[PDB]
From Swiss-Prot:
Name the UniProt record assigns to this protein: Chymotrypsin-like elastase family member 1
Gene3D superfamilies, alphabetized: Trypsin-like serine proteases (2.40.10.10)
Cofactor(s) the protein requires to work: Ca(2+)
Chain's role: Serine proteases that hydrolyze many proteins in addition to elastin.
Record: active site: 45, 93, 188
Length: 240
């Protein structure tokens, strides 16, 4: 999160940290959302690599004991059958993870709320992005969860020449583009929370930013549109 601020310890309890084993430690690599006691939603491109993955819930500071963490292994990975690592611009950047154990729900660990199928947001809707990702283009991961105010940019505007052009599709959400605030590497797979009818729901899965840099004027952060994938998500959980 570029141009973010520190989120309160209990503001976004469905946020998780996806980490892989490295030697004798684990490294953070991506965010995700807890959507079931034993199921996580994240980005497909986050699990392209055949690593050993674990999930941490109730996490706030990556390199210090918070006293609230729960650590669970990933037992099965289901990526969207249409996803293509050589073509993120094509969409379908979404995956579901089954955990080896069911986690315990509390004030720091809660299920994310999903929008209803087909739901589209108005231009300039109020949303927040959260994550432990790079705080600067080519910078460093953050230690504590960050948040940034990121209002949507509707399809007709985001798909115009001065913005992303044909690179973005209707199965994506655009947010930001102000040159100051944005997603960045290591935020991917995490939630975009949007306020709808007085409740925060997860409308997006962080997918990509411009190759020119994370916070670039007229190049909003691009998210997978969750509301496009509700049937698939339900179908997967009911059969696994
Ligand atoms: Ca910690
Ligand atoms: Xe990103």
């Amino acid at each position: 999160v570029v141009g973010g601020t520190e989120a309160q310890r209990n503001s976004w309890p469905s946020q998780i940290s996806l980490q892989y084993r490295s030697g004798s430690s684990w490294a953070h690599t991506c965010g995700g959302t807890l959507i079931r006691q034993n199921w996580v939603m994240t980005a497909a491109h986050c699990v392209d690599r055949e690593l050993t993955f674990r999930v941490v819930v109730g996490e706030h500071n990556l390199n210090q004991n918070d006293g609230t963490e729960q650590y669970v292994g990933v037992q099965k990975i289901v990526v969207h059958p249409y996803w293509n690592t050589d073509d993120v611009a094509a969409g379908y950047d979404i995956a579901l993870l089954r955990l080896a154990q069911s986690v315990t729900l509390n004030s720091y660990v809660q299920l994310g709320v999903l929008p209803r199928a087909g739901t589209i947001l108005a231009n300039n809707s109020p949303c927040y992005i959260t994550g432990w990702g790079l705080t600067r283009t080519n910078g460093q991961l953050a230690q504590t969860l960050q948040q940034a105010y990121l209002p949507t940019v509707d399809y007709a505007i985001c798909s115009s020449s001065s913005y992303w052009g044909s690179t973005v599709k209707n199965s994506m959400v655009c947010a930001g583009g102000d040159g100051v605030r944005s997603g960045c590497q290591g935020d991917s797979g995490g939630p975009l929370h949007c306020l709808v009818n007085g409740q925060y729901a997860v409308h997006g899965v962080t997918s990509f930013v411009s190759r020119l840099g994370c916070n670039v004027t007229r190049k909003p952060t691009v998210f997978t549109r969750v509301s496009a994938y509700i049937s698939w998500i339900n179908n997967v959980i009911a059969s696994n």
